[PDB]
Design an enzyme around this catalytic site. Sequence first.
Site, PDB file in Angstrom:
ATOM      1  N   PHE B 228      39.744  31.701  47.339  1.00 41.74           N
ATOM      2  CA  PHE B 228      39.259  30.626  46.440  1.00 41.74           C
ATOM      3  C   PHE B 228      38.092  31.114  45.596  1.00 41.74           C
ATOM      4  CE2 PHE B 228      42.408  28.018  48.283  1.00 41.74           C
ATOM      5  CZ  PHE B 228      42.244  27.997  49.701  1.00 41.74           C
ATOM      6  N   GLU B 232      35.619  37.245  46.673  1.00 46.84           N
ATOM      7  CA  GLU B 232      35.678  38.137  45.531  1.00 46.84           C
ATOM      8  C   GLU B 232      34.505  39.076  45.601  1.00 46.84           C
ATOM      9  OE1 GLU B 232      35.342  38.083  40.639  1.00 46.84           O
ATOM     10  OE2 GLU B 232      36.160  36.312  41.666  1.00 46.84           O
ATOM     11  N   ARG B 310      32.183  31.699  31.019  1.00 48.96           N
ATOM     12  CA  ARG B 310      33.421  30.890  31.102  1.00 48.96           C
ATOM     13  C   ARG B 310      33.177  29.376  30.909  1.00 48.96           C
ATOM     14  NH1 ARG B 310      38.686  31.079  32.312  1.00 48.96           N
ATOM     15  NH2 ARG B 310      38.448  33.315  32.639  1.00 48.96           N
ATOM     16  N   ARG B 342      37.328  29.039  42.573  1.00 50.63           N
ATOM     17  CA  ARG B 342      38.480  28.591  41.720  1.00 50.63           C
ATOM     18  C   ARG B 342      38.055  27.753  40.508  1.00 50.63           C
ATOM     19  NH1 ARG B 342      43.533  25.928  45.160  1.00 50.63           N
ATOM     20  NH2 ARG B 342      45.271  26.815  43.964  1.00 50.63           N
ATOM     21  N   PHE B 344      35.688  28.734  38.082  1.00 44.11           N
ATOM     22  CA  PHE B 344      34.711  29.780  37.730  1.00 44.11           C
ATOM     23  C   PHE B 344      33.798  29.341  36.552  1.00 44.11           C
ATOM     24  CE2 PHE B 344      33.565  34.120  36.153  1.00 44.11           C
ATOM     25  CZ  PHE B 344      33.225  34.781  37.336  1.00 44.11           C
ATOM     26  N   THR B 440      36.626  37.465  31.889  1.00 48.43           N
ATOM     27  CA  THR B 440      35.813  37.365  30.682  1.00 48.43           C
ATOM     28  C   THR B 440      35.121  38.700  30.413  1.00 48.43           C
ATOM     29  OG1 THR B 440      33.922  36.390  31.947  1.00 48.43           O
ATOM     30  CG2 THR B 440      35.418  34.842  30.840  1.00 48.43           C
ATOM     31  N   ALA B 509      40.588  35.320  38.625  1.00 42.95           N
ATOM     32  CA  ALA B 509      40.907  34.841  37.259  1.00 42.95           C
ATOM     33  C   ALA B 509      42.341  34.436  37.069  1.00 42.95           C
ATOM     34  CB  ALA B 509      40.490  35.848  36.228  1.00 42.95           C
ATOM     35  N   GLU B 691      43.833  28.775  38.955  1.00 45.18           N
ATOM     36  CA  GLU B 691      42.670  27.946  38.690  1.00 45.18           C
ATOM     37  C   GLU B 691      42.867  26.820  37.674  1.00 45.18           C
ATOM     38  OE1 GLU B 691      40.716  31.523  37.614  1.00 45.18           O
ATOM     39  OE2 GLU B 691      38.873  30.742  38.504  1.00 45.18           O
TER      40      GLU B 691
HETATM   41  N1  LIG Z   1      46.745  29.282  48.989  1.00 41.89           N
HETATM   42  C1  LIG Z   1      45.777  29.771  48.198  1.00 41.89           C
HETATM   43  N2  LIG Z   1      45.983  29.533  46.889  1.00 41.89           N
HETATM   44  C2  LIG Z   1      45.084  29.964  45.959  1.00 41.89           C
HETATM   45  C3  LIG Z   1      43.885  30.672  46.401  1.00 41.89           C
HETATM   46  C4  LIG Z   1      43.725  30.903  47.861  1.00 41.89           C
HETATM   47  O1  LIG Z   1      42.698  31.502  48.256  1.00 41.89           O
HETATM   48  N3  LIG Z   1      44.686  30.431  48.687  1.00 41.89           N
HETATM   49  N4  LIG Z   1      42.990  31.104  45.462  1.00 41.89           N
HETATM   50  C5  LIG Z   1      42.992  30.464  44.154  1.00 41.89           C
HETATM   51  C6  LIG Z   1      42.218  31.257  43.143  1.00 41.89           C
HETATM   52  S1  LIG Z   1      40.505  31.068  43.183  1.00 41.89           S
HETATM   53  C7  LIG Z   1      42.948  32.097  42.319  1.00 41.89           C
HETATM   54  S2  LIG Z   1      42.540  32.826  40.848  1.00 41.89           S
HETATM   55  C8  LIG Z   1      44.348  32.557  42.584  1.00 41.89           C
HETATM   56  C9  LIG Z   1      44.265  34.073  42.803  1.00 41.89           C
HETATM   57  O2  LIG Z   1      45.511  34.761  42.660  1.00 41.89           O
HETATM   58  P1  LIG Z   1      46.480  34.857  41.359  1.00 41.89           P
HETATM   59  O3  LIG Z   1      45.576  35.668  40.475  1.00 41.89           O
HETATM   60  O4  LIG Z   1      47.732  35.548  41.906  1.00 41.89           O
HETATM   61  O5  LIG Z   1      46.828  33.407  41.035  1.00 41.89           O
HETATM   62  O6  LIG Z   1      44.893  31.786  43.644  1.00 41.89           O
HETATM   63  C10 LIG Z   1      44.429  30.441  43.668  1.00 41.89           C
HETATM   64  N5  LIG Z   1      45.255  29.744  44.618  1.00 41.89           N
HETATM   65  O1  LIG Z   2      33.705  39.580  37.618  1.00 40.43           O
HETATM   66  C1  LIG Z   2      34.348  38.680  37.029  1.00 40.43           C
HETATM   67  N1  LIG Z   2      34.217  38.607  35.697  1.00 40.43           N
HETATM   68  C2  LIG Z   2      34.877  37.666  35.013  1.00 40.43           C
HETATM   69  O2  LIG Z   2      34.737  37.682  33.783  1.00 40.43           O
HETATM   70  C3  LIG Z   2      35.702  36.736  35.689  1.00 40.43           C
HETATM   71  N2  LIG Z   2      36.383  35.765  35.019  1.00 40.43           N
HETATM   72  C4  LIG Z   2      37.164  34.913  35.730  1.00 40.43           C
HETATM   73  C5  LIG Z   2      37.248  35.018  37.137  1.00 40.43           C
HETATM   74  N3  LIG Z   2      36.583  35.986  37.810  1.00 40.43           N
HETATM   75  C6  LIG Z   2      35.819  36.845  37.092  1.00 40.43           C
HETATM   76  N4  LIG Z   2      35.137  37.814  37.722  1.00 40.43           N
HETATM   77  O1  MOS Z   3      39.681  33.877  39.897  1.00 37.42           O
HETATM   78 MO1  MOS Z   3      40.687  32.907  41.421  1.00 37.42          MO
HETATM   79  O2  MOS Z   3      40.251  34.157  42.618  1.00 37.42           O
HETATM   80  S1  MOS Z   3      38.624  32.922  41.910  1.00 37.42           S
HETATM   81 CA   LIG Z   4      31.203  28.710  40.290  1.00 40.43          CA
END
Ligand SMILES: Nc1nc2c(c(=O)[nH]1)N[C@H]1C(S)=C(S)[C@@H](COP(=O)(O)O)O[C@H]1N2
Ligand SMILES: O=c1[nH]c(=O)c2nccnc2[nH]1
Ligand code: MOS
Ligand SMILES: [Ca+2]
EC number: 1.17.1.4
Lengths: 305, 755, 151, 51, 164, 164
Positions: B228, B232, B310, B342, B344, B440, B509, B691
């Site tokens: 989520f 990261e 963002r 999620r 951001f 970004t 992202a 997201e």
């Molecule tokens: N089940 C589940 N879904 C989720 C998440 C997770 O941690 N668990 N993370 C969310 C976030 S913060 C993001 S950006 C995406 C990350 O992977 P993607 O880039 O393949 O969508 O999953 C989203 N959906």
């Molecule tokens: O390090 C990051 N830089 C970004 O610009 C960004 N944008 C979206 C989600 N995660 C991110 N993480």
């Molecule tokens: O950019 Mo979804 O992992 S935080």
């Molecule tokens: Ca935040």
Amino acid sequence: PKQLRFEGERVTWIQASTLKELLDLKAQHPEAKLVVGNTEIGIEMKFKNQLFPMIICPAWIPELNAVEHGPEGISFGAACALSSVEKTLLEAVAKLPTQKTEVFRGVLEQLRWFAGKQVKSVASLGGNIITASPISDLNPVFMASGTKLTIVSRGTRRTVPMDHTFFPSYRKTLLGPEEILLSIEIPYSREDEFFSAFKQASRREDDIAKVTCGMRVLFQPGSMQVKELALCYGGMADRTISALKTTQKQLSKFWNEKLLQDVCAGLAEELSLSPDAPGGMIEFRRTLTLSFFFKFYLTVLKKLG
Amino acid sequence: DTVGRPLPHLAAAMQASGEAVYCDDIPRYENELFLRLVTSTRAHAKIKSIDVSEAQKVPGFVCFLSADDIPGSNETGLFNDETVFAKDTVTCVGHIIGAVVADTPEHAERAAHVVKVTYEDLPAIITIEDAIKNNSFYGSELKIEKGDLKKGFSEADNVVSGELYIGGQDHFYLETHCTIAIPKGEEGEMELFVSTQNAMKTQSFVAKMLGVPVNRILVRVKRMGGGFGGKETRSTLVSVAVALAAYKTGHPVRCMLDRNEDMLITGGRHPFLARYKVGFMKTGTIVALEVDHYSNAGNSRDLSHSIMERALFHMDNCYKIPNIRGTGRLCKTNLSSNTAFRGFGGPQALFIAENWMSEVAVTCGLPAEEVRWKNMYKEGDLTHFNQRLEGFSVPRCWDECLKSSQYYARKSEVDKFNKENCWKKRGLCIIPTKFGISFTVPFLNQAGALIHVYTDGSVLVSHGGTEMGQGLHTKMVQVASKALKIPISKIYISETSTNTVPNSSPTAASVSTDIYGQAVYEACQTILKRLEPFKKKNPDGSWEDWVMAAYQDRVSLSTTGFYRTPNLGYSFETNSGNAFHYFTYGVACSEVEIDCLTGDHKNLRTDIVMDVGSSLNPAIDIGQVEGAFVQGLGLFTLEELHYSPEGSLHTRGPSTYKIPAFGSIPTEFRVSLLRDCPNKKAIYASKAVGEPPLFLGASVFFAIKDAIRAARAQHTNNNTKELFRLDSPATPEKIRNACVDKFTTLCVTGAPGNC
Amino acid sequence: YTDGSVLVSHGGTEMGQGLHTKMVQVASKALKIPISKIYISETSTNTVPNSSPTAASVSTDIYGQAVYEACQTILKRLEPFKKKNPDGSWEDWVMAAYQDRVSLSTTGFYRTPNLGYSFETNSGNAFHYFTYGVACSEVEIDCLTGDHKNL
Amino acid sequence: DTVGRPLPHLAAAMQASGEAVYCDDIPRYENELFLRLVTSTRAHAKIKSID
Amino acid sequence: TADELVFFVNGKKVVEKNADPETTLLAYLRRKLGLRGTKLGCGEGGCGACTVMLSKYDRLQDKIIHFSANACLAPICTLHHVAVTTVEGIGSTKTRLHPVQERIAKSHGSQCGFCTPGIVMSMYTLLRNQPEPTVEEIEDAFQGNLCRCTGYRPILQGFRTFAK
Amino acid sequence: TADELVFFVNGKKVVEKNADPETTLLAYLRRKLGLRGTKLGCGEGGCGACTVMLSKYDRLQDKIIHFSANACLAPICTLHHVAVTTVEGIGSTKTRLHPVQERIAKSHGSQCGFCTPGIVMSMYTLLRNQPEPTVEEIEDAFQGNLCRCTGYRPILQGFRTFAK
Ligand SMILES: Nc1nc2c(c(=O)[nH]1)N[C@H]1C(S)=C(S)[C@@H](COP(=O)(O)O)O[C@H]1N2
Ligand SMILES: O=c1[nH]c(=O)c2nccnc2[nH]1
Ligand code: MOS
Ligand SMILES: [Ca+2]
Ligand SMILES: Cc1cc2nc3c(=O)[nH]c(=O)nc-3n(C[C@H](O)[C@H](O)[C@H](O)COP(=O)(O)OP(=O)(O)OC[C@H]3O[C@@H](n4cnc5c(N)ncnc54)[C@H](O)[C@@H]3O)c2cc1C
Ligand SMILES: O=c1[nH]c(=O)c2nccnc2[nH]1
Ligand code: MOS
Ligand code: FES
Ligand code: FES
Ligand code: FES
Ligand code: FES
């Protein structure tokens, strides 16, 4: 079933088979902690870092697990799980007249969104009552209803209605150091007797500042003239408290708009919170106490009306 | 070929049976130890001493680790502003000071609690207002400014202004942070198993702390039970400490955080404070808009800057605003450092926007959908950071969501209910969104893959992305199979590791499916080109026939694939150049009933239409719509983090912090994917779904605000153009307090007042 | 990696013959960087698939060619940055190529040319080349025991 | 450039010190079991039973 | 001088000769018995990731009774002569999935999957008490289980098929 | 009721309260103490892969005496008040190599490296008895040490640098 003894790095645990054994053990080690479901003691040991060197588990003892129907109410042993309390009350409610089950139905409303099935299946009645959390959802109900508590130690027995004096201070009950809660009889409601229970649906601090109440009126027979009134609240202090100043003023008054104004004025003052009371949410909590009474007022009028 | 098919998550059945292995499910080595972090009890203090006398006496105690045990560097974090272990001063309550190592995790817990830290308090800054007063910021103000504000504010029939706060959020991934570090004993080598979305910075950070080359450190990530964004970056706080214990003892060491440690230590979504001023016509047409955003960043920079960026990219939501200024300042406070979550910074800026948008409608006395529709970008339009909007599909989602929600008819049922009912009211709101797709930071828009085909024809895919439940590996497999023309049962993905794909961007992202999908695809293309001659000589042969022939001909059956996102690079000087590769769009309609006497509410029905281009997997993607939506409902309505005056988090588990539950979700919960819209920017015409749908949970928030305006019309006053601040989360407290009546004022009592 | 450290992985296994030592020497030479920046941890089926056994004496030949190729690929990729910045370090070119979304990872491969003997027809090369040597030894035997010393 | 130089085996120092990890030197998992082959004592025979 | 604790897990007898009063069932399951299907999410009874079924003879009701419990709070010392069923007790992709496991998997009721064993055990438990529950009974079964991924809709939907 | 076995390894006291007469020092070192530089090559005394140094106080000579031994054949039960030294007691690449370790490495005395600890401990034990030994004595040091890889020449050459 023979008594069992386990010993760890820090803790001795005794699994009592018999009522007599428990009361002997508590007489020898009055500081010993009982544990039934551990839903409270496991939190204290893990999170508040309390250590209790000696634990007695009294869960096997019949009595303490007995469910007894009597002429005054339904009596539950103190080791009874909230799921069993709940199952027996729901059965009582589906089978008896509405007028006998007023109190059972506020117990049930407080159990509605209480934890989940896992917790209710192991959390005992007695553990809730004796934990005496300021925010116990059942203690306000047992207090507003005068729920009778059978209390036993080696060679003593007494039955006391729960009232305001049962909780002297923060997380203490009026049990001496060798007494255990044996049993709790939740009363049928009488003619001219109406009960409501309500709770705040936000908790935000571990054991304070969540408003929860039991409310009870008994009228003179066939009338709307108050004979008894009880309004008990959790989440307004460091203990479950009763608005006694307020409700004594309403004795022999009639269930009307002036009664509504007088109780609410009474409450705003008697349950008033310092700008700095533990828990914050000062105005919301004041508003709920009045607003929960209004609901009780309107409900009582409907059971009359 | 399964692409576009509702194929269940590959690991689903093993997850249901408890056979799916997560980091702490990994068997222990006979000699494996356990680490527990020692953490500041003070917001801002100098450390006077640490005494471990009593911890030394706990059975199984091995050692206490502190800054002095560190061979390489104590300097860490994405921007080099953190310690691995706090040295002279602590600067937040969860601030890592040291770590206890023991033979059981029970013994590590017990010993850590009995470590005596002696402190000397120092002036703390906790809130955003504490920080503005003290000009305690990270860096300097950030800005997008297009047009003439003094001049838009002058063609303007109405000017409304105000302040708005949005609360933070805990990730509450069901599996908390966890690392296993295995010191190999040779050359500094160490193999780590970690619940992280960023295995590259885990690898770099551990190597940095240890003072060894990156090539010594192998990080392996099979799966997370949720990330989520909370994994990261902040996973390194555990990973680095456990690597140090592994280095120091020469034994395997693990740590999985308990929930309460996790919520204290590892940070969450940024709380935002906004001051805004909007200029508009009696028509509702927006003319000027100015917004200063303040995020509460906590005690290190981390990802705060790009979060603020963002945010400013999303301050328009779906609305053409001809004159516009929006700044952003990062507040430096004595709290745990906040991080990715999620959306951001998107959900925050987008909330601030629908907030003033809701006021514009109220001030003009016009129906909300009209003021929103009127102000909507048109296909082709330029945003405020000057990117063009192509395939701008909000108007479709919108019209379809209005129809499928039966909005107009329900808005009347709602008004009928508000007339009949004195102490309960209902609210209805339809809210649009667009969310920009790309990191970004342009350099993170890169992705690798590594494919082997074995001589039985079986295929092992490895890409740089991690599985945290979003079904990435499932989608990578559907792609590889589509692109190689073999069934999915012939293909397998095992894990993510720094030895198969180096230098990977965090799985963040929402772009992983786009960028790993492309990397994977290209590796499959290379392989197919190598296989062409064997296809040619044996057109009826099977995949296994061609593989064996390729192998016997000494043609390589292993390749890398790679992808860069093209034509990206926005500038903050110059205010130009694409920030995003594209945008995902959706619209949500929600209905609530509030209990005006308690502040309680029911979520009655929600209808979502989302544009996800052509879906790789309609089941996975709907599942993301749903879960993102419910997590935004949490953010906007339920989830409330609460601190002591002196900066200490009270809300450190499920009994005090409330995430949505089974019974929290709308009684009728309907989600549609917009049909017939091929997205040409991404793999097989699909769109990032991760997201984007989150901020749609704000439609519950704005339906509640609508229910409250109806309760205030009833009991508080007669001014239907009134504006009242409703902050987020709109908890029972906030809702009840806002429904001003005979009780909130005193009574009825008889008490004058109100009202 | 982005600190400029290199991880090499190849089909061949170490059994005391100094294969990894010789791949490290080749990769350093091919990349023109010190051997101390290059590491080989081990051999595995998930880095290099479908490998021949490390056998027939040819491991240095064939792996050294696979390693060389992949080193050449990296140099071709790092080239533009080396040009853009002739006076900087290895680490500068690597970090530069990373920020520029240049991939710093590649496979190499090598296939011995012109092999293929036929036992019918008796033609085509069986071998790539031949290794040759000569030894001279002296011994003294005990005629009464069957013992001997190698002198 | 070290090609052509008498560079010592990269792992030799660790082989001398007993730090180089061979297969059996890898630590055991807490639940790790051990296998011992059961082998024929006859050059050629039908297996009539195993007890 | 100290008694043996005797209990059963997925039908196998466990005799623990030196029970420590402070040992929780989740810790015993995971770190003594090696059955890591049952998870730690909170340690405080709120999330149900550690949900197991317990079965005992209620010397009063007659009846073997079946109920769920949070393993992170259950002292093993309460469990003398009690039977525990974990997720691995009900089925596996190695032999056969239980219908509960199959349905939540095929209905997209599982994302990260960390919460899934818990929910499987709350649903399994309900079915042992009530093999034909109502839709209302199915929803309330999960009052103690949290999911951060799914938004819950797909779980309830997959399980509605058990109702009537 | 049975006696404690007390010896030393690399200067560190081992107290074995439950020694099995059947346990060899090789097994105890690798599988109880976690010290795996001492190797198994035969279990019968012919290869020296398992060579350790042993020291005891001689009651008579006064003198602490140092000798080599095959840990595969040494019962730990004979080691009461004996001090063991293994390859990791004498140096390491994490601290500093002992000259012997450094020399065999740099002489190209180690190929696969499996015999190397035992050869090191043979040589280390010689030097512990005779700090400046002869070329003749150097060689007899290695009678019960086998090496499959090197043909022995570099070991002896690298080690001759200890005579003179
Ligand atoms: N089940 C589940 N879904 C989720 C998440 C997770 O941690 N668990 N993370 C969310 C976030 S913060 C993001 S950006 C995406 C990350 O992977 P993607 O880039 O393949 O969508 O999953 C989203 N959906
Ligand atoms: O390090 C990051 N830089 C970004 O610009 C960004 N944008 C979206 C989600 N995660 C991110 N993480
Ligand atoms: O950019 Mo979804 O992992 S935080
Ligand atoms: Ca935040
Ligand atoms: C997730 C969760 C949610 C919860 N939600 C609520 C809620 O909404 N409302 C609410 O009111 N409570 C709630 N609780 C509290 C719960 O109901 C009490 O924890 C529980 O009933 C205590 O019973 P137990 O058997 O588990 O007590 P234990 O932890 O075993 O013991 C608690 C205390 O009672 C004592 N004790 C037990 N029996 C006796 C006896 N017979 N005589 C004298 N002393 C005795 C013990 O000595 C100890 O001091 C919740 C708890 C959890 C874990
Ligand atoms: O199959 C093989 N052919 C060979 O010539 C060979 N040579 C040496 C070792 N293995 C070998 N294996
Ligand atoms: O070719 Mo060496 O493995 S016979
Ligand atoms: S781990 Fe969350 S309730 Fe047990
Ligand atoms: S599937 Fe991730 S918590 Fe439920
Ligand atoms: S192992 Fe060969 S002599 Fe001991
Ligand atoms: S170096 Fe291989 S056995 Fe001696």
